UniProtKB/Swiss-Prot annotation, chains A, B, C, D, E, F:
Changing residue 75 to Q: In CMTX1; localized in the Golgi apparatus without reaching the cell membrane. Changing residue 150 to W: In CMTX1; moderate. Changing residue 135 to V: In CMTX1; uncertain significance. Its main location: membrane. Changing residue 35 to M: In CMTX1; localized mainly on the cell membrane forming gap junction-like plaques. Belongs to the connexin family. Beta-type (group I) subfamily. The keyword Transmembrane helix applies. Changing residue 22 to G: In CMTX1; non-functional channel. The lineage of its organism: Eukaryota, Metazoa, Chordata, Craniata, Vertebrata. Changing residue 201 to W: In CMTX1; mild/moderate; non-functional channel. The gene is GJB1. Residues 1-22, 96-116 are cytoplasmic. Signal peptide: none annotated. This is Gap junction beta-1 protein.
Length: 206, 206, 206, 206, 206, 206
């Protein structure tokens, strides 16, 4: 259960929770992690030798794959996963530091400590939402369509003439792309909802 | 025993149990997981280079394998495994949240809490059954026969003429397919039985 | 020791033991697991590229390997291992459920509970013996001789003429086959002995 | 959580902390570790066969890749990671030794012990900053530009004539290089800030 | 420390110890395990493609490697490791069963229990020594010389004419072979010494 | 932290410590382990296919690589690591045995026990230093220069004419070689210092 515990900690939302981050956001995060693991291992796999171009010239396949796929889908997904996880790690380290300060004191102010923890948690949720939105926009920029292309025409050096060539598995890649963007959209919606509900609860407290 | 504990948690059915989910459904789930692991590692394996087509044209093998196998059997099985596991993760996170709320209160209403937990568990079981049925229908749509084909004729671009070519290991794939669909059918039957018995127990309580 | 603990649980025989399942059957089970792991990793390994047939025709090697080896030895051994393990998982889940019912009651009947546990354990042992015997018969059907063949003649499509070709490592495969069937026979004998001794003990109790 | 615990120990900063090393430096360190793992596994990968040079001469590809890439980016990153981690391991071992001496005594001086621990921690932070700066300078020396080159001309023996050839994935390598150098710069800034704040706190104590 | 604990359990010698099995035999066993792991992973590695024979005939390399190397060195070493470990697993399971019987009784005879445990331990040590001696004799039979051959002449079917061909790394294989046989001889000597000292201690008790 | 705990146990120096083995030697040992892991995985890697020789004759590459590299650098480093670790395992097993004897007695002499433990620890440190020095001399014998060669001339059978060929990555191999020998020299110096300081402390006690 160490993997599940770590994944929960990546959306732990510490003490100040809205029953949205702990239940729904955590499960969506774990689901996205599992889908990304499956896709990266099996579907994309190597994604370099699986790209075949109808050429005898050495190096034309590499440059042709580079031109159309500057960064892989799985690479962006893993990078987004790491950057989304980082605010949660910041909050966990901050709460551990605060607990250590409390135990050092043991060996008004508590209200201020709780307020600071709440503020840092809210800021981290906002930053997570911003990272998700930015990566969604980056995916839109680099890969407009949700479907993976099947045929591409290449004329870049050192390819002598224009050559047509093929992506490995467009259908599975399209399915996993739809899954990943659906999970990202659900995460964005849940993050916005959690921010709004946190603000409402804070206003109700005052 | 961490793997067994996680697999049990993927069918933990929390406190409200009918002696069907904990004993039978859990073991069938673990058995399906083991069979899928063995099949994905060894039987399908790469399932890309193992596909050989009698062609010299580069890229014809890839498109021919794509046309007849849009999504692999193991890919669908893993996706179904994840989607079936997700309601159980939702229930586990919900019960953890409820326990944390209880401990926060510690640091009528309990009857309502138990009722909500029972309702969420029943809804999750129904959703799991729905996912299993949907994936069974998807397997029927994509792969009508239980047996794996041996020979396929291909004429798609860029293959110059029609070419006949072969799947890697039809017999082992057929055996593992039969195992997986049998496990899925048993899971569907057990889910329906658990739903019915839960409804009967609830009626008996009232 | 987690692996050893899991393997013991796969022959845990819970509370009602005859000093045959816990000591001897568990060790034979673990020994068979280790031998299967070594064979699957190293000896059979890929067992697909290691099959070389004296042909230039693409796809003849695959169909020739399929005709003579419909299902691999290691595949059958792993499948038998899983199916033999499943009754033990059923018994472990059942005893966990019974313990949870006992603790729920805590938060004549006990004699009935012990009797039901004994009966389920006996039935599981019988089912394990049946699975072992069935897999032994399946091995006899598919692979009559204990020794692995060295040369096979192939004429199936698309091989143009009859071609002779070779298995990778007949001697190591034969040695590991003898080891595996010896372990299976010992397991069958021990299962029969445990059933008989359980019946004798039950009669002595009455 | 063992991996997270180890990574935290690699920036544990023991008892004398400034709320910069525990919260921010630890998370930046873990983020750099994750980015390096992803890059080394997927982006660079083998980085030897992915280098293709337009030659038929055997051995020209190896020497050409050697001339332009004496040491890989991931190799330097891993070496820097190890050397940066080593002062933290020294401090952890020293504090464990001091605790063992304390427990041996159990089975003024304590003030001196705390002072020595503080001094060793400060020296270790300074050494970590020095290692980071040295590796940044080494990266500047070996790879001036942040962007990865795409085309290189090679004339070294045994290549018969000058040949142009290509790096595998310049864009992903450039992105991960920018990420790694940004993380290193943030680590350098945070180390300098922690040193300054430690000196200020020490002066305030006196 | 789980691996070290398991390896110690593979020579645990339970309660009746002679300060030879626990200290010396355990360490020699672990050393042999580490050497075997290193050799199997790196030195022998695949040991199939590393065998190159000066032939164009397909299948001649496989049969030639089979004729001179019926079973690999690492295969025999792993098999010997498993068979040597099995008596220790029997003793561990027996002592666990005896402890469970003791706790069931809790929920003269003890002297008899200790005597039976001592006898089973002595018999297991004798069986371990017998297995070691048998495997040493098997290595002598299959591979007379300690040094690995470098050149072999092959004329078996389907090789058209006699062909000379080469083992991958004779020097490293020879070094690791010397290490493994030295460890096995030390284990044999220590097992004989432990048997003799156990008999002497038993006689001294009487 | 299990890996760190095991590595510390490989230099645990048990109870009689000089604040050199626990703090400095342990960290240098772990650093050497990490550097060896990185080098073996990435830098040397396969180190067999990475060796390319300008020949068409099959088997000339293997014999040429064998002649100049009888045993790999990483192979010697791993063997040295194991042999250096073994005295520490002996001491750990001995102290565990002594603790078990103490607890069996529980269920003058203690001074003698402490003296024997001190003596065994000193002898183990001396043996570790001897192993390090012997492996340093072996590296000097087999590989005189610290730098890895780039070009080698080969004329051994079956190579028809003299052929020049190339090592994979001389610069990275040279860097990692310098790192490993520097770590080994530091270990030797620290072992000598620990022996001297232990003798001085023992003389001071008397």
């Amino acid at each position: 259960m160490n993997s599940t515990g770590l994944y929960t900690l990546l959306s732990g939302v510490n003490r100040h929770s809205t029953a949205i981050g702990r239940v729904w956001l955590s499960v969506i995060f774990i689901f996205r992690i599992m889908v990304l693991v499956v896709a990266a291992e099996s579907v994309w796999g190597d994604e370099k030798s699986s790209f075949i171009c109808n050429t005898l010239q050495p190096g034309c396949n590499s440059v042709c794959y580079d031109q159309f796929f500057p960064i892989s889908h799985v690479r962006l997904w893993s990078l987004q996963l790491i950057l989304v996880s980082t605010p949660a790690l910041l909050v966990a380290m901050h709460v551990a530091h605060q607990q250590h300060i409390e135990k050092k004191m043991l060996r008004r102010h508590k209200v201020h400590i709780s307020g600071t923890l709440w503020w840092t948690y809210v800021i981290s949720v906002v930053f997570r939402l911003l990272f998700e939105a930015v990566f969604m926009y980056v995916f839109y920029l680099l890969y407009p369509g949700y479907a993976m292309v099947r045929l591409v025409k290449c004329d870049v050096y050192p390819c002598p003439n224009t050559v047509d060539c093929f992506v490995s598995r467009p259908t599975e890649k399209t399915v996993f792309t739809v899954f990943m963007l659906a999970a990202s959209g659900i995460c964005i919606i849940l993050n916005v909802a959690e921010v709004v509900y946190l603000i409402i609860r804070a206003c109700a407290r005052r």
